[PDB]
Design a protein around this ligand. Structure first.
Ligand SMILES: Cn1ncc2c(N)nc(-c3cccnc3)nc21
Length: 277
């Protein structure tokens, strides 16, 4: 907790319940920081009657989050560790999880807007990779969206094991599943899956094909198909992220550079509807 500001509980106001977390309920609320405008926050609490492992994992997640300082990584405001219930306090992301958000807004964004969301995610991952942090659990359900449409990588939980706190197979690179080689290049594979989630407005990768069939299909060369209206350069980028040989995948710095070029040449993101309504 040397990486975290300790907050007195009288500075926090819980206002409404917004979800259930691994360790307890999550609230939207307000935080008073050092006689100034109170700021909106998300408040994760540790359920009373926690075990000692749960307490360590809970506070350890805040310790990890406090080591990061990037526009596209969720900002930790501080922790309450000296009073009960213990809390992790972060910036508030009004639009919630990216996958759920896009499913509710199906077809309601421009392609340029969606690509800008992907660029922000890639910038956050570029920052993490540069700090030698391998996420291992990158998926749209772990990216939060604020009222300005900024996407931020947001779940840094410690109690994570691979599926079959679960890391699901459908987002995981083949070498990480088969040989437990989790690296920034396996996070790049996961980023390709996120790109597909964004471009489909939150469809489930591989639909309801089973886990065993997924790993069989993938190791046979199957890849998710192009979403409707998806720019060719964007789908080809997903395909590069899904190269079987990890050394052939782009780095996150490459992904950011490519997405920036597409944003600068926006005609590259246009579909038929943009030429014939
Ligand atoms: C809506 N919002 N804004 C920030 C935030 C967060 N850090 N965590 C969560 C969250 C975390 C775990 C389960 N449900 C919600 N939601 C948040």
């Amino acid at each position: 907790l040397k990486f975290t500001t300790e907050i007195h509980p009288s500075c926090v106001t819980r206002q409404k319940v917004i979800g259930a977390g691994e360790f307890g309920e999550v609230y939207k609320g307000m935080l008073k920081t050092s006689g100034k405008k109170e700021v909106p926050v998300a408040i994760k609490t540790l359920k009373a009657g926690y075990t000692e492992k749960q307490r360590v994992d809970f506070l350890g997640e805040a310790g990890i989050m406090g080591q990061f300082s990037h526009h596209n990584i969720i900002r930790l405001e501080g922790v309450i560790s000296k009073y009960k219930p213990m809390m992790i306090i972060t910036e508030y992301m009004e639009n919630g999880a990216l996958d759920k958000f896009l499913r509710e807004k199906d077809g309601e964004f421009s392609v340029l807007q969606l690509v800008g969301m992907l660029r922000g995610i890639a910038a956050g991952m570029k920052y993490l990779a540069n700090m030698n942090y391998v996420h291992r659990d990158l998926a749209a359900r772990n990216i939060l969206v604020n009222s300005n449409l900024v996407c931020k990588v947001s779940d840094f939980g410690l109690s994570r094991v691979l599926e079959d706190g679960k890391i699901p197979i459908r987002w995981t690179a083949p070498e990480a599943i088969s040989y437990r080689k989790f690296t920034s290049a396996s996070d790049v594979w996961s980023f390709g899956i996120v790109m597909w989630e964004v471009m489909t407005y939150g469809e489930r990768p591989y639909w309801e094909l089973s886990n065993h069939e997924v790993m069989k299909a993938i190791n046979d060369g199957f890849r998710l198909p192009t979403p409707m209206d998806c720019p060719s350069a964007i789908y080809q980028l997903m395909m590069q992220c899904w190269q079987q040989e990890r050394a052939r995948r782009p780095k996150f710095a490459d992904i950011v550079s490519i997405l920036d070029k597409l944003i600068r040449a926006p005609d590259s993101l246009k579909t038929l509807a943009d030429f014939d309504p």
